[PDB]
From Swiss-Prot:
The gene is dtxR. It comes from the Bacteria. The keyword Ribonucleoprotein does not apply. Iron-binding repressor of the dipheteria toxin gene expression. May serve as a global regulator of gene expression. Represses ripA under iron excess. Its main location: cytoplasm. Keywords: Cytoplasm, DNA-binding, Iron, Repressor, Transcription, Transcription regulation. Coiled coil: none annotated. This is Diphtheria toxin repressor.
Length: 218
């Protein structure tokens, strides 16, 4: 949980900050920043290149691939929401906030993040002045097929994406129990998702629709 994957996250955060600061992301630069290289950044970077997280450009700068950038962004979002939490609510001494949040970034789930944006006064910037990125990405709430569990719960519909369906029979089925963009009950079992809407009615979705309809926690 934090001694391999989090090394990767630390490296990605460092590259992100260097770009943010207007500094060319060079390996030596990353090395002093993290007080590493002995077990050089070189071996770690080569590993990230294999995983498709970054590419070493012609000069020597590190360019994050789109997937790497998406991961780097989530890490910065978690760190900065942690800083905001540690400062506004916990009240930890500002001189200790940076280091604590650097550890916390590796353990905060997306769900905790969603609650923090709801509980914090302002999530615009961190206490250190930098903007908190990826708030949008947080919330396409999620593919129904994944967000569903054997344990029922309410959620809100962000998109049905009927445009992408081939199996039309369920459109009217949904329309009857309403289900357009409102709370509903989600549940799994024999891998078949059912749904209850504002009108106590059930609709057993077919794979196609279950993979496509996207909800959003509330």
């Amino acid at each position: 949980m934090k001694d391999l994957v989090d090394t990767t996250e630390m490296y990605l955060r460092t590259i992100y900050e260097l770009e943010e600061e207007g500094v060319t992301p060079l390996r030596a630069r990353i090395a002093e920043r993290l007080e590493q290289s002995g077990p050089t950044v070189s071996q770690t970077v080569a590993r990230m290149e294999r995983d498709g997280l970054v590419v070493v450009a012609s000069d020597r700068s590190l360019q994050m691939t789109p997937t790497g950038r998406t991961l780097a962004t989530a890490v910065m979002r978690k760190a900065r929401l942690a800083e905001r939490l540690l400062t506004d609510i916990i009240g930890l001494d500002i001189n200790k906030v940076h280091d604590e949040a650097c550890r916390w970034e590796h353990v905060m789930s997306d769900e905790v993040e969603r609650r923090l944006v709801k509980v914090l006064k302002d999530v615009s910037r961190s206490p250190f002045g930098n903007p908190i990125p990826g708030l949008d990405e947080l919330g396409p709430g999620t593919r129904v097929i994944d967000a569903a569990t054997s344990m029922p719960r309410k959620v809100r519909i962000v998109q049905i994406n009927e445009i992408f369906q081939v199996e039309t029979d369920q459109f009217t089925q949904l329309l009857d129990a309403d289900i357009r963009v409102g709370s509903e009950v989600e549940i799994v079992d024999r891998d078949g998702h059912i749904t209850l809407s504002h009108n106590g009615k059930d609709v057993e979705l077919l794979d196609d629709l279950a993979h496509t309809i996207r909800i959003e926690e509330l």
